[PDB]
Design an enzyme around this catalytic site. Structure first.
Site, PDB file in Angstrom:
ATOM      1  CG  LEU A  16      -1.903  -1.170   1.305  1.00  0.00           C
ATOM      2  CD1 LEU A  16      -2.716  -1.156   2.572  1.00  0.00           C
ATOM      3  CD2 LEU A  16      -2.838  -1.191   0.103  1.00  0.00           C
ATOM      4  CD  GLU A  18       8.463   0.155  -0.655  1.00  0.00           C
ATOM      5  OE1 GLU A  18       8.606   0.691  -1.771  1.00  0.00           O
ATOM      6  OE2 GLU A  18       8.394  -1.088  -0.507  1.00  0.00           O
ATOM      7  N   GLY A  19       8.099   3.772   3.022  1.00  0.00           N
ATOM      8  CA  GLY A  19       8.617   4.907   3.779  1.00  0.00           C
ATOM      9  C   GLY A  19      10.005   4.591   4.305  1.00  0.00           C
ATOM     10  CB  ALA A  20      12.103   6.675   6.473  1.00  0.00           C
ATOM     11  CB  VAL A  24       1.707   0.309   4.944  1.00  0.00           C
ATOM     12  CG1 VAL A  24       0.314  -0.078   5.418  1.00  0.00           C
ATOM     13  CG2 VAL A  24       2.379   1.308   5.892  1.00  0.00           C
ATOM     14  CE  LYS A  40       4.868   2.594  10.333  1.00  0.00           C
ATOM     15  NZ  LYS A  40       4.440   3.979  10.707  1.00  0.00           N
ATOM     16  CG  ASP A 137       6.282  13.350   8.372  1.00  0.00           C
ATOM     17  OD1 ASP A 137       6.401  14.292   7.557  1.00  0.00           O
ATOM     18  OD2 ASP A 137       6.653  12.212   8.133  1.00  0.00           O
TER      19      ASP A 137
HETATM   20  N1  LIG Z   1       0.584   4.238  10.736  1.00  0.00           N
HETATM   21  C1  LIG Z   1       0.927   4.390   9.416  1.00  0.00           C
HETATM   22  N2  LIG Z   1       2.091   5.054   9.064  1.00  0.00           N
HETATM   23  C2  LIG Z   1       2.303   5.200   7.681  1.00  0.00           C
HETATM   24  C3  LIG Z   1       1.377   4.695   6.730  1.00  0.00           C
HETATM   25  C4  LIG Z   1       0.213   4.023   7.139  1.00  0.00           C
HETATM   26  C5  LIG Z   1      -0.688   3.536   6.242  1.00  0.00           C
HETATM   27  C6  LIG Z   1      -0.417   3.713   4.942  1.00  0.00           C
HETATM   28  N3  LIG Z   1      -1.431   3.171   4.264  1.00  0.00           N
HETATM   29  C7  LIG Z   1      -2.376   2.674   5.117  1.00  0.00           C
HETATM   30  C8  LIG Z   1      -3.546   2.068   4.857  1.00  0.00           C
HETATM   31  C9  LIG Z   1      -4.395   1.638   5.875  1.00  0.00           C
HETATM   32  C10 LIG Z   1      -3.947   1.847   7.190  1.00  0.00           C
HETATM   33  C11 LIG Z   1      -2.734   2.508   7.369  1.00  0.00           C
HETATM   34  C12 LIG Z   1      -1.918   2.910   6.364  1.00  0.00           C
HETATM   35  N4  LIG Z   1       0.042   3.910   8.477  1.00  0.00           N
END
Ligand SMILES: Nc1nccc(-c2c[nH]c3ccccc23)n1
EC number: 2.7.12.1
Length: 330
Positions: A16, A18-20, A24, A40, A137
């Protein structure tokens, strides 16, 4: 890693985001009828582990206080470890506001929708600020739609098919950077385009930095693009001066980022190539309005208040939630 199975029930079926931190993923839950959840999965690296543990502690606090997500923070369902990766399971949300706009060709959101989203964002972050937290953020990638289903209709004005959300309800995600009043405050917070001037100038920050980020979010929703198309700190400041006017003297005096300043003025040449770029791409804030009707002036009044330079003078979310811009919702 699609096909992997976490905690013997959650099978990965898609990425779904991507990040540092990691990623997810969407999972099928084999112990609850195959219904889908988000998970996550955090990298096995100290700084991200510690951020996830922080996130879980924040989410437990917020989930206990607001178990129904009245204030629209994402709901954590459970958390566990898997091969040294902390995994946090969430309710499945739909697309981020960023991804929706991208997939729509960077067409801006309709004002009625912006009104509803801004309200919900302010209501959510305010809940946070009421609980001695700052998110730090906020950005469109961290505002997700509850359901991103849409109807499509030919728009004759722009000669193309456009998507309209059935329901624009949102939730705020990513509490990895969230910081209580009494805890250590990182030197640098926020993603650059949403970053407040007090953070750039290293003056210290608190709740008002989130308000700045919301200001920037709402502009992007309205325009479909950032007004700060930059990856350089000094230029970002030049852009702010073009859009909002000169920085307050007292902030320039306080800062130790002396390299950005000459005498007590931003060390910026408007005649340089960078100077042309800024003058081309950035202009006084109200010159971005697409209409002069009152609904627009009021959005822009709010935005200007959120983009007050002085964090002590900036509008609070409590004060924002009563802004005239929000009446057509009542
Ligand atoms: N806590 C967190 N930090 C970063 C991203 C997400 C997150 C990205 N896409 C999602 C879809 C459904 C529930 C959560 C997410 N969640």
């Amino acid at each position: 890693q699609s096909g992997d199975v976490l905690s013997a029930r959650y099978e990965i079926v898609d990425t779904l985001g991507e990040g540092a931190f990691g990623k997810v993923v969407e999972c099928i839950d084999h112990k609850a009828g195959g219904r889908h959840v988000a998970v996550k999965i955090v990298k096995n690296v100290d700084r991200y582990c510690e951020a996830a543990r922080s996130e879980i502690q924040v989410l437990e606090h917020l989930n206990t206080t607001d178990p129904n997500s009245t204030f629209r923070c994402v709901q954590m369902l459970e958390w566990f470890e898997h091969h040294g990766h902390i995994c946090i399971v969430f309710e499945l949300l739909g697309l981020s506001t960023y991804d929706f706009i991208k997939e729509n060709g960077f067409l801006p959101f309709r004002l009625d929708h912006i009104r509803k989203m801004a309200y919900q964002i302010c209501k959510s972050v305010n809940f946070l600020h009421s609980n001695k937290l700052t998110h730090t953020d906020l950005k469109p990638e961290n505002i997700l739609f509850v359901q991103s289903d849409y109807t499509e209709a030919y728009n004759p004005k722009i000669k193309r098919d456009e998507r309209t959300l059935i329901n624009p309800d949102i939730k705020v995600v990513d509490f990895g950077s969230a910081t209580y009043d009494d805890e250590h405050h990182s030197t640098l917070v926020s993603t650059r385009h949403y970053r407040a001037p007090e953070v750039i100038l290293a003056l210290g920050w608190s709740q008002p930095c989130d308000v700045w980020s919301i200001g920037c979010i709402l502009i992007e929703y309205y325009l479909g693009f950032t007004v700060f198309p930059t990856h350089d700190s000094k230029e970002h400041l030049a852009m702010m001066e073009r859009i909002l006017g000169p920085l307050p003297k007292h902030m320039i005096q306080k800062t130790r980022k002396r390299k950005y300043f000459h005498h007590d003025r931003l060390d910026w040449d408007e005649h340089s190539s960078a100077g042309r770029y800024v003058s081309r791409r950035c202009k006084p804030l109200k010159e971005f309005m697409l209409s002069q009707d009152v609904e627009h002036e009021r959005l822009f009044d709010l935005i200007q208040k959120m983009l007050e330079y002085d964090p002590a003078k900036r509008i609070t979310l409590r004060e924002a939630l009563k802004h005239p811009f929000f009446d057509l919702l009542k």
